Amino acid sequence: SISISYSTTYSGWTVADYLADWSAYFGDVNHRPGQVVDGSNTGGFNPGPFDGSQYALKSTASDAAFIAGGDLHYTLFSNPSATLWGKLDSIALGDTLTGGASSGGYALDSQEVSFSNLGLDSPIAQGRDGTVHKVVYGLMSGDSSALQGQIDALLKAVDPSLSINSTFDQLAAAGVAHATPA
Numbered sequence: 001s002i003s004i005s006y007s008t009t010y011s012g013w014t015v016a017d018y019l020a021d022w023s024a025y026f027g028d029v030n031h032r033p034g035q036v037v038d039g040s041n042t043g044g045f046n047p048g049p050f051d052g053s054q055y056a057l058k059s060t061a062s063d064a065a066f067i068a069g070g071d072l073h074y075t076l077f078s079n080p081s082a083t084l085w086g087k088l089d090s091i092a093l094g095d096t097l098t099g100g101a102s103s104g105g106y107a108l109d110s111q112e113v114s115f116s117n118l119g120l121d122s123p124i125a126q127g128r129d130g131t132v133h134k135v136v137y138g139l140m141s142g143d144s145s146a147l148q149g150q151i152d153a154l155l156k157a158v159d160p161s162l163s164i165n166s167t168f169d170q171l172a173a174a175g176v177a178h179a180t181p182a
């Protein structure tokens with residue numbers, strides 16, 4: 001089942017409000033044709049260069065950052081082009097990204113919320129329609145809708161009363177979340 005970690009700061013927030021707000025603040029890095037700039041809005045893989053157990057990206061304007069964890073692959077120019085696919089187990093949100101391939105991984109100096117045991121697996125053949133691609137490219141674009149839809153499905157699978165409209169505290173009471181010190 002999905003497992004959610006949250007700073008006590010967010011105990012009374014709904015997941016949806018937290019995500020809508022975090023993503024709006026992270027803001028669109030404009031990773032689109034004509035605007036991709038290596039080292040500015042590409043993010044990076046560990047160990048990389050285009051595959052690894054983590055993909056991480058910091059905002060081009062705020063300190064906000066996220067880390068996707070699992071077994072991830074980016075096709076670059078190979079068919080189907082510009083596709084992130086593979087197994088996505090976790091998404092961590094916060095600010096102040098640190099690390100990288102030369103450190104052995106990425107971390108957030110301030111990790112606010114993480115969603116683990118996501119169990120998302122997208123085959124390469126689905127290309128940019130795959131869930132993994134939609135979730136992460138949505139985040140890169142300042143749009144947590146795809147992530148929200150996957151979290152909602154995972155929460156309903158535990159119990160239909162649970163959803164992104166539950167508070168983190170409600171989800172902790174339901175057995176799927178736990179707090180970390182603020």
Ligand code: HEM
Binds near residue numbers: 034043074128137
């Ligand atoms: C090491 C990380 C990455 C590098 C170096 C990279 C590089 C590129 C390059 C060179 C382009 C062509 C457009 C341009 O140059 O302006 C591009 C486009 C694109 N990339 Fe990335 N990318 C990375 C990560 C990702 C990730 C993780 C995703 C999805 C989750 C993604 C999704 C896309 C999409 C959707 C396009 C536009 C495709 C289109 O509409 O033609 N990229 N990327």
